[PDB]
Design a protein around this ligand. Structure first.
Ligand SMILES: Nc1ncnc2c1ncn2[C@@H]1O[C@H](COP(=O)(O)OP(=O)(O)OP(=O)(O)O)[C@@H](O)[C@H]1O
Ligand SMILES: [Mg+2]
Ligand SMILES: [Mg+2]
Lengths: 985, 75, 147
């Protein structure tokens, strides 16, 4: 019953059982401010059984500082009643309700209880009941730049997954009778001592294939010991071991008990004396609120700060805390008591939603128990912050002005940002900018570009889109939605539909790039990141990179002339398998999936392209004869797809599918075994089909089998689609047609003038002339994983399973086939919320124009274990050029459009360096080892003319600069690296 | 006896060996002369690779055999 | 990237490989047309093979793509000209020069590896009927690798 068309990306993170158990839990949320509504949004997107809201407080203007579901026409109405209607539309499977009053007994109806904006006495009263009744209780709070989280899942919480990693699996070479297990050659098991594993598909020891867990003794990186296996056998050949994980029992403590003896989590190890301060400070805030009719201390007030510090002293004395309070930090907390930022709200909402999912699914390791977070380093220092400037001004930005002031509000309102991409991170970033009021002044502007279109699978974590929006451009929907959220951004947003790359330089030129204030990346491929990084380096603009992978996430900030660029932090590349392995000797399901992908492409894509090009290009045959690697293959494909094997109905498609089955699963295996018999030996006398090589076996077509029938159906459907015929699904027709099929005899063959040219000519003269068929085109089958009715994933799954059956490999279901073939990247909404929060917290650092490198932070986190870390950016490497300090990244030479000889003379004279190589992109303009005549011919030309002549392409009118890479040697002959040249046209 | 070994660079090295000399001894001599570790040596004669633990006579190596040495690898 | 490629090209220019001659096509630094001469004491004697090498953007952190152009009858070389080589897949490091790869390809031409072949029929013929394999190889290198 799980909607795999909507939760496709989330299932690869949670799983079927996790979501099935999650869809049976009720969640109550007390408090409906920015943090509460964010938590509700994340939970609704998650897919819980239901959500209940409770917030009777009437709306106020300042409450709109972070609540993006409120409008100025909703002032005076309870937040829950005006929020339920908008929340119910996010997901159709998650009902949203509102409760007028909350009695204690009513709490028995829910599975999780989230509490925000509630006094300490009420929280204690609720927790004293929700603890002994085994109901999860999570309490969150967000005061200015500070945040607190508390989790309590009872005293007998059972946690199934403790790290979020899949169980460690490996392929076994052989196992002795002493329990020694060794992987294949150069394969690391990676297990540790005390672990439990299970064995499957072990030859010689079938008993061990049952799966009973056994102890693990790590004897080395490639071998381990399991104990005694004397009874079950003497030696085991091959097989697969799989890690077995045991549940862990975690016992939480109630709030009342954990007040006296808290258990902290340190979000950063350089400053571990703060959480003891915040534990007192938040309680002091609650006490002061209770002491002033629920009115928090006024912003930047000294009298209220003194009273708050007195409350802190009294509480610290009362609770017997032997910690010396830090007056500065506590009074800072006092100043920002009434603050309300959207970045902190998003961050804490993501975290708490993740905690709710942990509570519901009994998965991942939860916080134990207190989590106090602060980003006080983000407070601006180049503007005036005082009580006069921080007073509320009766606008929707009061919750931010009360922390930063009106001057920083003006600074924000005049930004000209550029967001690349409109994925999940892009949408969240735009929401945050809309709430903060970024670029709402006269000189502000925002530009967002993205060329993809909305798909159904994108609706699980991109909340600015709706099912009615499927098929439309992302940028338009995002711009309209954020204009609706904040009407002041009407006309302040420009949306492009262009892919950012070398080909888009005509639109995103120098004029566009000289007005920006910062660039934010929301991409998913390294190429675009590198291109944008180079462009930013050229234009010297701050950049904000952010990436996610399942539950892990990282954010990086690049500041001009201060930090290194993102390219210097390039990630390791992908993995590819040897062609020999894929073609003939697979040993894993991934190999079969790649082989199936190649089979799909070679069956339904390339012959179709050849046929279409033959019917389109007037001189296709002659060009292909002397161009294609296998012109005979092309000619035979054309002949087969035009005359020899042109289907006339669906029965012929079924016949062709049967023929292809026999040709790919019965004859090729026979030929390969003929070349290398099962008893063959290497040149060293070793057996051939041993170790990483498995002896295949031909398959005989059994119609009653499920996999064979699936393959036949898929192949017939794809062939009919290629020829535009009508497919059918009833098994009766297939059984009837395939009953009367006589397989042509096949035996392996050993092989042993201009006949070949005459053979090609015979093939050619058999082809119908192109003029005889005008307007007749065949539709190639373009691979599309996201569609479930195109028989693509079905074909790949069937072919992979059949080839696995050939080589006795374990088949995989459609889920794993879709995961591997499509290279789907798991993604979550909570990770998106957290990364957006971190990026927006660094953005305020960028706005203030902080200079020190200790003021910036690159962030990394893993929510499967509750890990957060922040590290300073790496300083840009320096170098010595002509006895001067030069930044390796943020330096360049600016020269006019002079002739090559003048440029060389300038470098010889001004820099005292001899030029030995000069290139412009991928073209070699000049080199010191070139013949003298060519150089003498090239010297008197200007750089632009030289580039146009060499590249055989005129420079565009919009070009205003040239980036030249120069390698030059010093006077002594030592190569010295120099920054690039910026020729000014 | 004497033999000649030709490298990938076209160089010819004349060696004084015996048919009973082990392949390990020849590889050690090659490492001494060129600094190429024995593990990376691939000696070919008449389309056959000489293997460690054997003797030259095992490969019917005789007077002035034009052997060859090449890089080691696989795949 | 560009500096490393230029360094390799300059080193090749200073020292003529004699048996090899690699150079960019036209003026493009990311497409080279290397030339290999068949070993004298090999069935491929008296033959010239031209290979196309395409450097990746992340060179030398990624291996280049090398493809044969002249037809060759070899166990480890498919019809497309692919090469069954290890240094191009995992042993690749940002320390191996293109000259080393060319020397390795020359060695692979010198002696095939039928134990882990790429063309099973050719490997089967090689292991069973050596003389027929030699004759076919000589015929191919005379038909295709000359002129
Ligand atoms: N070069 C580029 N120029 C512009 N936008 C780009 C570029 N590369 C990627 N994008 C955008 O980046 C976003 C990628 O985000 P995301 O991966 O969440 O979405 P998706 O690719 O549609 O989905 P999925 O990852 O589930 O297949 C898309 O909006 C895509 O348009
Ligand atoms: Mg998409
Ligand atoms: Mg994507």
């Amino acid at each position: 019953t799980i909607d795999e068309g909507l939760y496709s990306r989330q299932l690869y993170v949670l799983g079927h059982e996790a979501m099935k158990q999650m869809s049976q839990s009720n969640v109550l949320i007390i408090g409906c401010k920015g943090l509460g509504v964010e938590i509700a949004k994340n939970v609704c997107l998650a897919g819980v059984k239901s959500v209940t809201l409770y917030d009777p407080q009437p709306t106020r203007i300042e409450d709109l500082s972070s609540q993006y579901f409120l409008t100025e026409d909703d002032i005076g109405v309870p937040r829950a009643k005006v929020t339920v209607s908008k929340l119910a539309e996010l997901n159709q499977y998650v009902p949203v309700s509102v409760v007028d009053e909350l009695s204690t007994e009513y709490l028995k109806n829910f599975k999780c209880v989230v509490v925000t904006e509630t006094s300490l006495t009420k929280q204690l009263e609720i927790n004293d009941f929700t603890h002994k009744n085994h109901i999860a209780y999570i309490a969150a709070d967000s005061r200015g730049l500070f945040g607190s989280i508390f989790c309590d899942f009872g005293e007998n919480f059972i946690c199934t997954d403790t790290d979020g990693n899949e169980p460690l699996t490996g392929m076994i070479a052989s196992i002795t009778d002493d329990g020694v297990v060794t992987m294949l050659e150069e394969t690391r098991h990676g297990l540790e001592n005390g672990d439990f594993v299970k064995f499957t598909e072990v030859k010689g020891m079938p008993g061990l294939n049952d799966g009973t867990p056994r102890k693990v003794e790590v004897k080395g990186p490639y071998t381990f010991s399991i104990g005694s296996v004397k009874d079950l056998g003497s030696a085991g050949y091959n097989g697969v071991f799989t890690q077995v994980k045991v549940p862990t029992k975690i016992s939480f403590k109630s709030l009342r008990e954990s007040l006296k003896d808290p258990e902290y989590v340190y979000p950063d190890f350089g400053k571990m004396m703060r959480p003891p301060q915040y534990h007192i400070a938040f309680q002091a805030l609650s006490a002061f609120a209770d002491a002033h009719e629920g009115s928090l201390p006024r912003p930047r007030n000294d009298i209220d700060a003194a009273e708050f510090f007195e409350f802190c002293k009294k509480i610290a004395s009362t609770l017997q805390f032997d910690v010396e309070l830090d007056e500065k930090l506590i009074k800072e907390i006092s100043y920002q008591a009434r603050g309300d930022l959207v970045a902190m709200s998003a961050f804490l909402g993501g975290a708490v939603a993740q905690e709710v999912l942990k509570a519901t699914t009994s998965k991942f390791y939860p916080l134990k128990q207190y989590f106090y977070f602060d980003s006080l380093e983000s407070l601006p220092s180049s503007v005036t912050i005082s009580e006069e400037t921080c007073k509320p001004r009766g606008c929707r930005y009061d919750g931010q002005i009360a922390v930063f002031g009106s001057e920083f509000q003006e600074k924000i309102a005049s930004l000209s940002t550029f967001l690349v991409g409109a994925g999940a991170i892009g949408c969240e970033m735009l929401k945050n900018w809309a709430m903060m009021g970024v670029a709402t002044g006269e000189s502000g502007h925002i530009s967002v570009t993205d060329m993809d279109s909305i798909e159904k699978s994108n609706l699980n974590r991109q909340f600015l889109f709706r099912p009615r929006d499927v098929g439309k451009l992302k940028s338009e929907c995002a711009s309209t939605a954020v204009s609706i959220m904040n009407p002041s951004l009407t006309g302040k947003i420009t949306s492009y539909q262009e892919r950012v790359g070398p080909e888009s330089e005509g639109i995103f030129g120098d004029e566009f790039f000289e007005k920006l204030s910062l660039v934010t990346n929301a991409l998913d491929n390294v190429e675009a990141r590198m291109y944008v990084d180079r462009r930013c380096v050229f234009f010297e603009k701050p950049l904000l990179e952010s990436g996610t992978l399942g539950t892990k996430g990282n954010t990086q900030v690049v500041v001009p002339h201060l930090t290194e660029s993102y390219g210097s932090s390039q990630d390791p590349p992908e993995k590819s398998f040897p062609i020999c392995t894929l073609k003939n000797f697979p040993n894993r399901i991934e190999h079969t999936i790649a082989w199936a992908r190649d089979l799909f492409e070679g069956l339904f894509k390339q012959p179709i392209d050849n046929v279409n090009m033959y019917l389109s290009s007037p001189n296709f045959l002659e060009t292909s004869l002397k161009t294609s690697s296998n012109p005979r293959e092309v000619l035979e494909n054309i002949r087969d797809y035009l005359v020899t094997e042109k289907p006339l109905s669906f029965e012929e498609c079924i016949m062709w599918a049967r023929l292809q089955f026999d040709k790919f699963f019965n004859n090729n295996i026979q030929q390969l075994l003929f070349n290398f018999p099962k008893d063959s030996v290497t040149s060293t006398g070793q057996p051939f089909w041993s170790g990483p090589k498995r002896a295949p076996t031909p398959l005989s077509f059994d119609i009653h089998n499920r996999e064979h029938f699936d393959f036949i159906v898929a192949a017939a459907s794809l062939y009919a689609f290629n020829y535009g015929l009508k497919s059918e699904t009833d098994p009766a027709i297939y059984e009837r047609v395939l009953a009367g099929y006589n397989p042509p005899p096949f035996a392996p063959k050993s092989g042993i003038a201009n006949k070949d040219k005459q053979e090609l000519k015979s093939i050619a003269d058999s082809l119908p002339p192109p003029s005889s068929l005008v307007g007749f085109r065949l539709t190639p089958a373009e691979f599309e994983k996201d569609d479930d009715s195109n028989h693509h994933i079905d074909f790949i799954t069937a072919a992979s399973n059949l080839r696995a059956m050939n080589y006795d490999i374990t088949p995989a279901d459609r889920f794993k086939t879709k995961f591997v073939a499509g290279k789907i990247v798991p993604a979550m909404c909570t990770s998106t919320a957290v990364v957006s929060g971190l990026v927006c917290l660094e953005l305020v650092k960028l706005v203030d124009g902080k200079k020190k490198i200790e003021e910036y932070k690159n962030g990394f986190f893993n929510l499967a274990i509750g890990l957060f870390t922040f590290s300073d950016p790496i300083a840009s490497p320096k170098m010595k050029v002509n006895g001067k300090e030069i930044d390796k990244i943020w330096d360049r030479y600016n020269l006019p459009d002079c002739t090559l000889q003048e440029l060389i003379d300038y470098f010889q004279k001004e820099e005292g360096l001899e030029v030995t190589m000069l290139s412009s992109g991928v073209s070699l303009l000049y080199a010191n080892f070139q013949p003298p005549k060519k150089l003498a011919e090239r010297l008197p030309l200007k750089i632009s003319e030289l580039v146009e002549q060499i590249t055989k392409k005129k420079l565009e009118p919009f070009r205003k600069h040239l980036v030249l890479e120069i390698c030059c040697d010093d006077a002594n002959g030592e190569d010295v690296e120099v920054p690039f040249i910026c020729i000014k046209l | 006896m004497q033999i000649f070994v030709k490298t990938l660079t076209g160089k010819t090295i004349t060696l004084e060996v015996e048919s009973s000399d082990t392949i390990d001894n020849v590889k050690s001599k090659i490492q001494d002369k060129e600094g190429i570790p024995p593990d990376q040596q691939r000696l070919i004669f008449a389309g056959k690779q000489l293997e460690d633990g054997r003797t030259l006579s095992d490969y019917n190596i005789q007077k002035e055999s034009t052997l060859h040495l090449v890089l080691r690898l696989r795949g | 990237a560009l500096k490393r490629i230029n360094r390799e090209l300059a080193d090749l220019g200073k020292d003529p490989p004699s048996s090899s001659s690699a150079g960019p096509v036209g003026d493009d630094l990311f497409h080279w047309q290397a030339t290999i001469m068949g070993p004298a004491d090999s069935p491929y004697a008296g033959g010239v093979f031209f290979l196309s090498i395409h450097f990746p953007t992340d060179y030398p952190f990624k291996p280049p793509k090398v493809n044969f152009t002249t037809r060759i009858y070899h166990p480890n070389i498919n019809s497309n000209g692919s090469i069954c080589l290890d240094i191009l897949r995992d042993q690749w490091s940002p320390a191996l020069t293109i000259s080393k790869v060319l020397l390795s390809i020359s060695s692979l031409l010198t002696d095939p590896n039928p134990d882990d072949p790429l063309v099973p029929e050719i490997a089967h013929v090689y292991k069973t009927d050596r003389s027929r394999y030699e004759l076919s190889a000589r015929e191919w290198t005379r038909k295709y690798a000359i002129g």
